Amino acid sequence: LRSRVTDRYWRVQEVLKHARHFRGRKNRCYRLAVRAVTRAFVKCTRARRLKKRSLRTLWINRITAASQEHGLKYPAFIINLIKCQVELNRKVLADLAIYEPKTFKSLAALAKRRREEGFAAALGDGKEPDGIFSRVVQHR
Amino acid sequence: ISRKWEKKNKIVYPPQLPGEPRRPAEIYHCRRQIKYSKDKMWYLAKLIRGMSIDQALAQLEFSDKKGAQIIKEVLLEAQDMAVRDHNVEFRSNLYVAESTSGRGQYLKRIRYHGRGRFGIMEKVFCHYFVKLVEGPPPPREAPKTAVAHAREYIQELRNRTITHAL
Amino acid sequence: AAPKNRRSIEVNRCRRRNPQKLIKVKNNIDVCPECGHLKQKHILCGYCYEKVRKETAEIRRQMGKQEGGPFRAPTTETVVLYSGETPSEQDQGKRIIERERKRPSWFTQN
RNA sequence: ACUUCCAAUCAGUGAAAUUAACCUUCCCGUGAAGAGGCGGGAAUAAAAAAAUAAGACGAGAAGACCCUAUGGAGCUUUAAUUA
RNA sequence: ACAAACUCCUAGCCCAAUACCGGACUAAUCUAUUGAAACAUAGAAGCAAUAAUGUUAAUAUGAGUAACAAGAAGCCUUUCUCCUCGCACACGCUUACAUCAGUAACUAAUAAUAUACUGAUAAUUAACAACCAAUAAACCAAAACAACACUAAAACGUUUAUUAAUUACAUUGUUAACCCAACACAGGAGUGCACCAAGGAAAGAUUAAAAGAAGUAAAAGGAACUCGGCAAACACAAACCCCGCCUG
RNA sequence: ACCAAAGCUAGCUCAACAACAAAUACAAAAAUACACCAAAAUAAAAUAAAACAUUCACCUAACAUUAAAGUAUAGGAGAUAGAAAUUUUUAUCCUGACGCUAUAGAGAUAGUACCGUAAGGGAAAGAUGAAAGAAUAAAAGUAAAAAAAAGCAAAGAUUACCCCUUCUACCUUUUGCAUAAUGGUUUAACCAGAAAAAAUCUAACAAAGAGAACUUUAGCUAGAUACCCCGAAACCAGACGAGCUACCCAUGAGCAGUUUAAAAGAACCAACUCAUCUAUGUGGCAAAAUAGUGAGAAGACUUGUAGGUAGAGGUGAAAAGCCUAACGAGCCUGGUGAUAGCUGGUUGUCCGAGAAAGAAUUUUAGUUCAACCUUAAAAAUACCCCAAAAACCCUAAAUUCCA
Ligand SMILES: [Mg+2]
Ligand SMILES: [Mg+2]
Ligand SMILES: [Mg+2]
Ligand SMILES: [Mg+2]
Ligand SMILES: [Mg+2]
Ligand SMILES: [Mg+2]
Ligand SMILES: [Mg+2]
Ligand SMILES: [Mg+2]
Ligand SMILES: [Mg+2]
Ligand SMILES: [Mg+2]
Ligand SMILES: [Mg+2]
Ligand SMILES: [Mg+2]
Ligand SMILES: [Mg+2]
Ligand SMILES: [Mg+2]
Ligand SMILES: [Mg+2]
Ligand SMILES: [Mg+2]
Ligand SMILES: [Mg+2]
Ligand SMILES: [Mg+2]
Ligand SMILES: [Mg+2]
Ligand SMILES: [Mg+2]
Ligand SMILES: [Mg+2]
Ligand SMILES: [Mg+2]
Ligand SMILES: [Mg+2]
Ligand SMILES: [Mg+2]
Ligand SMILES: [Mg+2]
Ligand SMILES: [Mg+2]
Ligand SMILES: [Mg+2]
Ligand SMILES: [Mg+2]
Ligand SMILES: [Mg+2]
Ligand SMILES: [Mg+2]
Ligand SMILES: [Mg+2]
Ligand SMILES: [Mg+2]
Ligand SMILES: [Mg+2]
Ligand SMILES: [Mg+2]
Ligand SMILES: [Mg+2]
Ligand SMILES: [Mg+2]
Ligand SMILES: [Mg+2]
Ligand SMILES: [Mg+2]
Ligand SMILES: [Mg+2]
Ligand SMILES: [Mg+2]
Ligand SMILES: [Mg+2]
Ligand SMILES: [Mg+2]
Ligand SMILES: [Mg+2]
Ligand SMILES: [Mg+2]
Ligand SMILES: [Mg+2]
Ligand SMILES: [Mg+2]
Ligand SMILES: [Mg+2]
Ligand SMILES: [Mg+2]
Ligand SMILES: [Mg+2]
Ligand SMILES: [Mg+2]
Ligand SMILES: [Mg+2]
Ligand SMILES: [Mg+2]
Ligand SMILES: [Mg+2]
Ligand SMILES: [Mg+2]
Ligand SMILES: [Mg+2]
Ligand SMILES: [Mg+2]
Ligand SMILES: [Mg+2]
Ligand SMILES: [Mg+2]
Ligand SMILES: [Mg+2]
Ligand SMILES: [Mg+2]
Ligand SMILES: [Mg+2]
Ligand SMILES: [Mg+2]
Ligand SMILES: [Mg+2]
Ligand SMILES: [Mg+2]
Ligand SMILES: [Mg+2]
Ligand SMILES: [Mg+2]
Ligand SMILES: [Mg+2]
Ligand SMILES: [Mg+2]
Ligand SMILES: [Mg+2]
Ligand SMILES: [Mg+2]
Ligand SMILES: [Mg+2]
Ligand SMILES: [Mg+2]
Ligand SMILES: [Mg+2]
Ligand SMILES: [Mg+2]
Ligand SMILES: [Mg+2]
Ligand SMILES: [Mg+2]
Ligand SMILES: [Zn+2]
Numbered sequence A: 001l002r003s004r005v006t007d008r009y010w011r012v013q014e015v016l017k018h019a020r021h022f023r024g025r026k027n028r029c030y031r032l033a034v035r036a037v038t039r040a041f042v043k044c045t046r047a048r049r050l051k052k053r054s055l056r057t058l059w060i061n062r063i064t065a066a067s068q069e070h071g072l073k074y075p076a077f078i079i080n081l082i083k084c085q086v087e088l089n090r091k092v093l094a095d096l097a098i099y100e101p102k103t104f105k106s107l108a109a110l111a112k113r114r115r116e117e118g119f120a121a122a123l124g125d126g127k128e129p130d131g132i133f134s135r136v137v138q139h140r
Numbered sequence B: 001i002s003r004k005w006e007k008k009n010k011i012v013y014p015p016q017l018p019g020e021p022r023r024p025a026e027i028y029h030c031r032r033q034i035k036y037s038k039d040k041m042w043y044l045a046k047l048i049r050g051m052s053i054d055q056a057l058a059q060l061e062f063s064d065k066k067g068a069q070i071i072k073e074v075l076l077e078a079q080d081m082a083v084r085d086h087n088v089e090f091r092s093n094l095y096v097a098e099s100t101s102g103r104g105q106y107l108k109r110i111r112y113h114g115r116g117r118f119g120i121m122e123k124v125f126c127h128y129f130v131k132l133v134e135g136p137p138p139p140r141e142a143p144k145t146a147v148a149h150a151r152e153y154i155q156e157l158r159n160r161t162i163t164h165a166l
Numbered sequence C: 001a002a003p004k005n006r007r008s009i010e011v012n013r014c015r016r017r018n019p020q021k022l023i024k025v026k027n028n029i030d031v032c033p034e035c036g037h038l039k040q041k042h043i044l045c046g047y048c049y050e051k052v053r054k055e056t057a058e059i060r061r062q063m064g065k066q067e068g069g070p071f072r073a074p075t076t077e078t079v080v081l082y083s084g085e086t087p088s089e090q091d092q093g094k095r096i097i098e099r100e101r102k103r104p105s106w107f108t109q110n
Numbered sequence D: 001a002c003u004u005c006c007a008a009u010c011a012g013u014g015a016a017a018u019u020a021a022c023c024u025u026c027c028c029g030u031g032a033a034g035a036g037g038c039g040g041g042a043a044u045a046a047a048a049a050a051a052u053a054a055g056a057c058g059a060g061a062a063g064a065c066c067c068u069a070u071g072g073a074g075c076u077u078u079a080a081u082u083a
Numbered sequence E: 001a002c003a004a005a006c007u008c009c010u011a012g013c014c015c016a017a018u019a020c021c022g023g024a025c026u027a028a029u030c031u032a033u034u035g036a037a038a039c040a041u042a043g044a045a046g047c048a049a050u051a052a053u054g055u056u057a058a059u060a061u062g063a064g065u066a067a068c069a070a071g072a073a074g075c076c077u078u079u080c081u082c083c084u085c086g087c088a089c090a091c092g093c094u095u096a097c098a099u100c101a102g103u104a105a106c107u108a109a110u111a112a113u114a115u116a117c118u119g120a121u122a123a124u125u126a127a128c129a130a131c132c133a134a135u136a137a138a139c140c141a142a143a144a145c146a147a148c149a150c151u152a153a154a155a156c157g158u159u160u161a162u163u164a165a166u167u168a169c170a171u172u173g174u175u176a177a178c179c180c181a182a183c184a185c186a187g188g189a190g191u192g193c194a195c196c197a198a199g200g201a202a203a204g205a206u207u208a209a210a211a212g213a214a215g216u217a218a219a220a221g222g223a224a225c226u227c228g229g230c231a232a233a234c235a236c237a238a239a240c241c242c243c244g245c246c247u248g
Numbered sequence F: 001a002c003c004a005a006a007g008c009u010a011g012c013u014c015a016a017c018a019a020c021a022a023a024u025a026c027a028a029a030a031a032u033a034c035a036c037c038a039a040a041a042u043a044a045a046a047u048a049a050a051a052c053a054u055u056c057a058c059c060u061a062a063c064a065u066u067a068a069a070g071u072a073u074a075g076g077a078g079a080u081a082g083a084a085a086u087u088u089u090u091a092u093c094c095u096g097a098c099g100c101u102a103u104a105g106a107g108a109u110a111g112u113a114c115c116g117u118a119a120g121g122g123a124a125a126g127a128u129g130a131a132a133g134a135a136u137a138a139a140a141g142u143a144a145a146a147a148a149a150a151g152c153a154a155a156g157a158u159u160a161c162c163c164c165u166u167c168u169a170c171c172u173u174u175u176g177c178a179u180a181a182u183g184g185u186u187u188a189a190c191c192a193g194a195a196a197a198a199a200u201c202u203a204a205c206a207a208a209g210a211g212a213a214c215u216u217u218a219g220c221u222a223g224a225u226a227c228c229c230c231g232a233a234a235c236c237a238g239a240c241g242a243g244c245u246a247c248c249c250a251u252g253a254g255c256a257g258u259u260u261a262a263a264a265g266a267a268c269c270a271a272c273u274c275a276u277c278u279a280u281g282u283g284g285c286a287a288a289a290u291a292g293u294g295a296g297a298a299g300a301c302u303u304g305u306a307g308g309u310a311g312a313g314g315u316g317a318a319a320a321g322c323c324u325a326a327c328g329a330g331c332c333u334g335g336u337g338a339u340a341g342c343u344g345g346u347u348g349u350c351c352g353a354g355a356a357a358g359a360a361u362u363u364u365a366g367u368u369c370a371a372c373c374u375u376a377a378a379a380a381u382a383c384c385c386c387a388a389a390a391a392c393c394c395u396a397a398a399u400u401c402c403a
Helices: A008-016 A029-070 A074-083 A090-099 A103-124 B007-010 B038-045 B054-064 B068-084 B146-157 C008-014 C046-065
Strands: B028-033 B096-101 B105-111 B119-124 B126-134 C029-031 C038-040 C078-081 C095-096
Touching: A008 A029, A008 B007, A029 A074, A029 A090, A029 A103, A074 A103, A090 A103, A090 B126, B007 B028, B038 B096, B038 B126, B054 B068, B054 B096, B068 B096, B096 C046, B105 C095, C008 C095, C046 C095
Parallel strands: C078 C095
Antiparallel strands: B028 B126, B096 B126, B105 B119, C029 C038
16 A cells, blocks of 8 residues: 655645745745744744843833933932832833823932932931931831 | 747737727737747847837847847737737837747757766757737836935935834 | 856846846937838948849859850950940940840949 | 967857855954854945956865774785695 | 843743653545545554755756857859878678758757758669589699799699589679767778879958967077976087896 | 646556467578587585684475474584474355555566677656547746845844844764864655564453463463664676787788898888877867877788687786776676675654663674663652761871661
């Protein structure tokens, strides 16, 4: 009972589906296609991992620029926003930086205020005064 | 073998509704198994494209290549069928729409070398295809002006988005 | 030296479709006022030169008949005649070739 | 110096080894220890035709050298078994 | 501050891997029953190629690159311009030869046209050449322009006798441009007469780069070159060694 | 749009059953004249024994089938080889196919073309229809439709092709490969894991089980689970080869001139023969040539036709030369799927768990044992581990052993 593979056409089609937009001979010849397609998928999955650090880099830059406009550097801005107990994404923060410049300058004013409060608190060398923005709320 | 091109003359259209644009005559013609090579034939085919049939005949006539006499006869045949078998008023009204070479079937032979070595020598044949259309030759495209470029560039600067930003 | 790699069709299209390897369009083509065929500006008309050539061939045949052998050639000037023509005194004393065709319009009497 | 065959341009006919894919730069480092592909820098419209051979550890022959198979063979005798 | 596969967070089908070893499914065939258009349970196997300097077929690249050919003019076979392996037979090839016709494409390494492609028709005629008796007996005495010799001691038959069907005309070879080298090969090929009386064309068209091949000439110098006076010369001669004695 | 692509038939596998007439062995295809006929001597080796000498099934014969039995025996008592006594078997009829469809199946449309002097090798291909007494556009390669700074050619993406940013082709092979290690132009079709002793798993019946012979202290019987592909140089038997070349045996044929008393292995120099030296040529004009230049040129000279010697051999003015474009031993067909501890290859997806060298070895390119490990099972303690304890002169980090 001799058997041959009749459906070889669709087997090839399934790997050429992905190969159509490649340059040169990879979009035709089944060898070249197979290899370039495996390459393509591997870089696909690595890109999934990268694109999270890329987007986060982008965000940090935009936050840095927005912060620079108001004369405050990136680390200062972020730390002080945190020490005020305001937890905001860098995604949400960069979006505020572009599409709501007013609110964002409000934030930068807040952070700057909180920081000067910090310098004054630590240089003052006494334990008593709580700057109005230095109090810490425990939730109920 | 595949014969298709020849059959493109066998299409019969539905009659004309009143006052529409008159669809200009298309004539197809080919010549199969010319003793010329495909690559040389290509240059002749490339030369006459878009020309009016009279200019094409003029060029071909004085050209040196042995393909010239061939493509010439083919254009004359095409013209004769254009006026006779189809109906075309004013036989100089034709221009060349599409001109092209395909490879025909090839002959195989031995080519002796030396020290008893042989190469495999392929006798070359090719087909010549031409499509003629009745009407004055389409206008040749003018090189982009500075007023064009500046328009592209502005249209691009103005197509930007703030990315990943919403 | 043996080529290190097969070239892609891209590279080949670049090389052999170059504007230099394309056949140039000859701009000096005109029509000949007589037969209205095509000719190049600096070259004689092909179709005209044909009928000239044929007639020269035939007149050379008849003047080959008027000569007896290979080495025997006339010392007189020659003048060719056509049906209905009789020699002028300027042209007499010369060898005469007589022809059936009435004198062709492009060939003058002089 | 000059002639002739090649030669280069036009017209016919038309092979060969070779070739993972190539969208096929230079420098200095690095690295399976000598990089067009890595790192840090440089330089850089796009294609032809003509040349020169520095590189592609260039192309040709599963190195004739060397060593290793409980691989072969030819030659010589006090190798060992012997018609 | 920025920085991971680490750790949180929101959801899950819930945690890497070469040799070897376990599991779950399934592509394509065929056979049992179903199924009706692609079928689902079983049973079976020539049961699944991106890799063997894999095998066959076909296509590219190198590449329209390397390389190939036809002396001039005319009235179309007539003159010219040049170079010289020519005609027979033997062997061997087998119709490639002859006439008329056709060549789009096949053969020619291109064309023109055709001794070499295709079709039809014909053809070399025997006195030359092949085939073509035996047995007895005499005969020591070279060919060599052959007188006579030489050493190396020389191929070849006449005549006498005994019988030999006896009787027109047997049968067979008769073309060629040819054969052996894969080729319509710068090569290999015996003999008799020839040096032309016979055979043939070294250039498809240009342009006049380099580098290559072949040839010619060169001021003064004449081996200073280089392993070597190799190659080349308006030279062509002398001498000395080593090794073999010598021709082979 | 070209080039191409598709059919189902020709026939095959495997198995049952059981046109004369003439002409020919003259140099086959030639009617015809004196002879002769006719003949026979063990199979060898490749290979197993991890070498190799004794030994190595099958290869000739028939004897079959179920057993006795892989038992008695025979063996460098190694590798392996291997009976018989004695037992079993019902008739024919009843043919087909979980066999191939044109790279398959015969080598086959054929032993033909073609390749070889010769023995011998040995192909490729066919596809419309009732009727031709009717005329799908899907592989690679190309065309429609040259190409614009940048870089394994993609990916993340973007309004946007690029431009940005991130990435050392793939196999094989190794301690380690982007390697400048091997392999591949590309497409299509072909192209490589076979065994049932022991075991596990699922069932039958059970002190028994098997449709005969056997095995049985839970066993027996049945099913299912298993172990590749391509490569030498070689060696042995029998054929075919001396139209090349080596040497002979027949029978023929050449050698002009010039010099010399001379045909004297004397001079000079042609035809003819060789092959010195240089340059071209190197897939050539040529699987050894062409141009110049050279040696010999009445002799151990060249050359024609026809015989002869054949591989454990022939022939050799020995070069280990030559014996038909590869001779330290010809070519062909068998043995022959020779044998390769050595390269090179080995085809679907997805999950579990996962290895680094202690011994011996003609062994160190390999095997076979231990240790680690994987898959099943049965159990009880396992690592960690405080005192206490382990040598005598000096002797650190630390081990061993245990609640
Ligand atoms: Mg089948
Ligand atoms: Mg994550
Ligand atoms: Mg080709
Ligand atoms: Mg050319
Ligand atoms: Mg580039
Ligand atoms: Mg280093
Ligand atoms: Mg470097
Ligand atoms: Mg060139
Ligand atoms: Mg170079
Ligand atoms: Mg490289
Ligand atoms: Mg080198
Ligand atoms: Mg090697
Ligand atoms: Mg050895
Ligand atoms: Mg050995
Ligand atoms: Mg982070
Ligand atoms: Mg795992
Ligand atoms: Mg298979
Ligand atoms: Mg395949
Ligand atoms: Mg190779
Ligand atoms: Mg392959
Ligand atoms: Mg090509
Ligand atoms: Mg080139
Ligand atoms: Mg050339
Ligand atoms: Mg010529
Ligand atoms: Mg003869
Ligand atoms: Mg031709
Ligand atoms: Mg004869
Ligand atoms: Mg004869
Ligand atoms: Mg004759
Ligand atoms: Mg040859
Ligand atoms: Mg020429
Ligand atoms: Mg020059
Ligand atoms: Mg010179
Ligand atoms: Mg000179
Ligand atoms: Mg001088
Ligand atoms: Mg000197
Ligand atoms: Mg010097
Ligand atoms: Mg010296
Ligand atoms: Mg010299
Ligand atoms: Mg000395
Ligand atoms: Mg000597
Ligand atoms: Mg001599
Ligand atoms: Mg052995
Ligand atoms: Mg073995
Ligand atoms: Mg051995
Ligand atoms: Mg045996
Ligand atoms: Mg077949
Ligand atoms: Mg033959
Ligand atoms: Mg295609
Ligand atoms: Mg880029
Ligand atoms: Mg690396
Ligand atoms: Mg490999
Ligand atoms: Mg290594
Ligand atoms: Mg390296
Ligand atoms: Mg290498
Ligand atoms: Mg290697
Ligand atoms: Mg390679
Ligand atoms: Mg068992
Ligand atoms: Mg049990
Ligand atoms: Mg032996
Ligand atoms: Mg052996
Ligand atoms: Mg003989
Ligand atoms: Mg002989
Ligand atoms: Mg003489
Ligand atoms: Mg002499
Ligand atoms: Mg010379
Ligand atoms: Mg001499
Ligand atoms: Mg001498
Ligand atoms: Mg001798
Ligand atoms: Mg010796
Ligand atoms: Mg020796
Ligand atoms: Mg040989
Ligand atoms: Mg094997
Ligand atoms: Mg031992
Ligand atoms: Mg080993
Ligand atoms: Mg314990
Ligand atoms: Zn005119």
